[PDB]
Write an enzyme that holds these catalytic residues in place. Sequence first.
Site, PDB file in Angstrom:
ATOM      1  N   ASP B  16       0.816  -1.216   0.000  1.00  0.00           N
ATOM      2  CA  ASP B  16       0.000   0.000   0.000  1.00  0.00           C
ATOM      3  C   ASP B  16       0.858   1.278   0.000  1.00  0.00           C
ATOM      4  O   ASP B  16       2.032   1.241   0.354  1.00  0.00           O
ATOM      5  CB  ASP B  16      -0.912  -0.012   1.220  1.00  0.00           C
ATOM      6  CG  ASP B  16      -2.101   0.912   1.082  1.00  0.00           C
ATOM      7  OD1 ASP B  16      -2.471   1.288  -0.057  1.00  0.00           O
ATOM      8  OD2 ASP B  16      -2.696   1.256   2.119  1.00  0.00           O
TER       9      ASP B  16
HETATM   10  C1  LIG Z   1      -1.419  -2.105  -5.527  1.00  0.00           C
HETATM   11  C2  LIG Z   1      -2.848  -1.548  -5.532  1.00  0.00           C
HETATM   12  C3  LIG Z   1      -3.768  -1.838  -6.705  1.00  0.00           C
HETATM   13  C4  LIG Z   1      -3.366  -0.706  -4.366  1.00  0.00           C
HETATM   14  C5  LIG Z   1      -2.516  -0.347  -3.150  1.00  0.00           C
HETATM   15  S1  LIG Z   1      -1.635   1.115  -3.474  1.00  0.00           S
HETATM   16  P1  LIG Z   1      -3.002   2.353  -3.323  1.00  0.00           P
HETATM   17  O1  LIG Z   1      -3.658   2.477  -4.708  1.00  0.00           O
HETATM   18  O2  LIG Z   1      -4.069   1.932  -2.298  1.00  0.00           O
HETATM   19  O3  LIG Z   1      -2.301   3.709  -2.921  1.00  0.00           O
HETATM   20  P2  LIG Z   1      -2.833   4.585  -1.712  1.00  0.00           P
HETATM   21  O4  LIG Z   1      -3.245   3.761  -0.480  1.00  0.00           O
HETATM   22  O5  LIG Z   1      -4.063   5.427  -2.121  1.00  0.00           O
HETATM   23  O6  LIG Z   1      -1.644   5.510  -1.372  1.00  0.00           O
HETATM   24  C1  LIG Z   2      -2.645  -3.487  -1.408  1.00  0.00           C
HETATM   25  C2  LIG Z   2      -4.166  -3.650  -1.462  1.00  0.00           C
HETATM   26  C3  LIG Z   2      -4.815  -4.071  -2.787  1.00  0.00           C
HETATM   27  C4  LIG Z   2      -5.020  -3.457  -0.195  1.00  0.00           C
HETATM   28  C5  LIG Z   2      -4.900  -1.996   0.205  1.00  0.00           C
HETATM   29  O1  LIG Z   2      -5.613  -1.256  -0.755  1.00  0.00           O
HETATM   30  P1  LIG Z   2      -7.217  -1.041  -0.573  1.00  0.00           P
HETATM   31  O2  LIG Z   2      -7.628   0.258  -1.153  1.00  0.00           O
HETATM   32  O3  LIG Z   2      -7.936  -2.127  -1.284  1.00  0.00           O
HETATM   33  O4  LIG Z   2      -7.583  -1.135   1.014  1.00  0.00           O
HETATM   34  P2  LIG Z   2      -7.808   0.274   1.775  1.00  0.00           P
HETATM   35  O5  LIG Z   2      -8.976   0.971   1.183  1.00  0.00           O
HETATM   36  O6  LIG Z   2      -8.079  -0.007   3.204  1.00  0.00           O
HETATM   37  O7  LIG Z   2      -6.592   1.117   1.651  1.00  0.00           O
HETATM   38 MG   LIG Z   3      -4.648   2.212  -0.075  1.00  0.00          MG
END
Ligand SMILES: CC(C)=CCSP(=O)(O)OP(=O)(O)O
Ligand SMILES: CC(C)CCOP(=O)(O)OP(=O)(O)O
Ligand SMILES: [Mg+2]
Lengths: 221, 226
Positions: B16
């Site tokens: 994340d």
């Molecule tokens: C690897 C994927 C698809 C999601 C985790 S990175 P993210 O888009 O949630 O980035 P952020 O949490 O918004 O900084």
């Molecule tokens: C790495 C991952 C796909 C899980 C974290 O991303 P997400 O947006 O699905 O979960 P959150 O909304 O809690 O950040």
């Molecule tokens: Mg996220």
Amino acid sequence: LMPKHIALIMDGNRRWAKDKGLDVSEGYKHLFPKLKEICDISSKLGIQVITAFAFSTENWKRAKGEVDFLMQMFEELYDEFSRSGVRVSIIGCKTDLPMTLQKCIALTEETTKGNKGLHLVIALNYGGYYDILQATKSIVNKAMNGLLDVEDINKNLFDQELESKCPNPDLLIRTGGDQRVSNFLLWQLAYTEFYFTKTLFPDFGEEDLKEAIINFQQRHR
Amino acid sequence: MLDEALMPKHIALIMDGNRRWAKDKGLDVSEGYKHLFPKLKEICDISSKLGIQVITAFAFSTENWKRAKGEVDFLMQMFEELYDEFSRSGVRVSIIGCKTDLPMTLQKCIALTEETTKGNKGLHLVIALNYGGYYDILQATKSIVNKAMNGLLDVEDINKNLFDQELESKCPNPDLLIRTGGDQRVSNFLLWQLAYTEFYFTKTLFPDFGEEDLKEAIINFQQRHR
Ligand SMILES: CC(C)=CCSP(=O)(O)OP(=O)(O)O
Ligand SMILES: CC(C)CCOP(=O)(O)OP(=O)(O)O
Ligand SMILES: [Mg+2]
Ligand SMILES: CC(C)=CCSP(=O)(O)OP(=O)(O)O
Ligand SMILES: CC(C)CCOP(=O)(O)OP(=O)(O)O
Ligand SMILES: [Mg+2]
């Protein structure tokens, strides 16, 4: 604003006693009074549900003397909460408990079922695996008697069969410093915010709880 | 201090912080996402050197479909790069999650990457792609119901051990979960499998996550080992 459902892993009671040079039983005697105190504090702040982990399905492997002590002690549930204004439910496998304790639990649930304030769900002989398994066996049973189809099986259907119901915990708080869920509300904690503290459960006060809620409010979901 | 003889065997990884990392440098969201697989690949190489045997990394959740159409379509097209990234890595690659709800092109990229790397005898990388914890449990349950009704098992055989074999993420379960980006939740990742997993949350954004941060997590894990 306020989390409506807080899950609570009530860990650290034995360490609390041993570090103080007290008998382990002294640690355990603070369990229900402390939890009651947290219910009162949480009630005033507008929290609707607390789900509290009191004994897991794995704790039968503890020293027989301690298991025996805990099982007698759990009968004090009725005195602590009957007249408290809290609505009390127990989740977990009740049929494994001593029958005195099963009666005590059923009495507490009955006497408090009219209460309109905070809902305290006590997990006693509970595990997340157990919860998912009983759900699954209930779902299989029904599919074998044509009461549901395989395409009907979805998140919603599981939320119905589980013992811990929607809405799920907003915040999980675990005392004692360990960072695990230890087979607590596995399905139900999918999106719950975790708060871990080194503070042992018998030391966990009003300010510790407020610190936790303040911490939760700062987190973007 | 790092005890080579007490390495966790299975690390799970919530990757994340990629969007924020990009926007923290004013860049476009897409530029953050392009670090995912190269970073993951580096983490595998580091982990392999340490003696870690399995990594399960959360690349796309069953909820991530709710995101911006452009972000989603860019991700789905980017994920096809897994073959270039991993086919010559020496890592054995598997994917978990609902393959048939993905673009057919990515389904074929996946199949080729799994086939190409299935003979690799080192680290096993499990990419969780369109996976969720709910999904895993529901698909295990449907499978068990289908067997139940075709006489293939009795309702009496339904126990923890059976569920372990029907779930997509397998034994041994993760010893250690690492989530980058500072959020302290599992976000519908490996729910059943995380029952006793040690959690380690770090504010480091995924693209800044390095060997030191990993070693810090493992030392941390080893000092709370029950
Ligand atoms: C690897 C994927 C698809 C999601 C985790 S990175 P993210 O888009 O949630 O980035 P952020 O949490 O918004 O900084
Ligand atoms: C790495 C991952 C796909 C899980 C974290 O991303 P997400 O947006 O699905 O979960 P959150 O909304 O809690 O950040
Ligand atoms: Mg996220
Ligand atoms: C009340 C029960 C059974 C468990 C939580 S307290 P504990 O017995 O695990 O005591 P410690 O965590 O060992 O301090
Ligand atoms: C309060 C509770 C029964 C949940 C914690 O249980 P436990 O400490 O006995 O299990 P762990 O050893 O995994 O922490
Ligand atoms: Mg404990």
